[PDB]
Each structure stands twice: as C-alpha cells, then as structure tokens.
C-alpha cells in the first residue's frame, strides 16, 4: 500500500519485460501489495520503474 525503500539482497536481471532490473545492495522505492509478490518498484540508481520480485528484497 505504502511506499518504503527497500534494498536488493541479489542481483536480479530483467526477463519478462515488464520487471526492473538491479544489483545487490541498489535501493529500490517499492509500493507493496497482497496479491502476490510481484511489486511495482523504482530504481533510485537508474531512474527506471518495474516489477520486482519481493523475496529479493528487504527493507532498507
């Protein structure tokens, strides 16, 4: 619902094209949801927005 900054515990690389790359360690502000956990996620390192998979992230 809320927004919160969260870190990348893994590398994760983009293949579903609509997904967000990042590196471990990149900062990411994620609007989280209950439906699942694909989460719409934007980078502040590249400035890009897309889904991100929620088990590879943590809070910051």
Known sequence: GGVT???????????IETDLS?????RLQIVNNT?????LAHSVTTGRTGYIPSNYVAPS
Do not use: C, I, Q, R
């Open 5 to 15: 900054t969260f870190v990348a515990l893994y590398d994760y690389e983009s293949w």
């Open 35 to 39: 439906e699942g956990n694909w989460w």
């Open 22 to 26: 990042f590196k471990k360690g990149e």
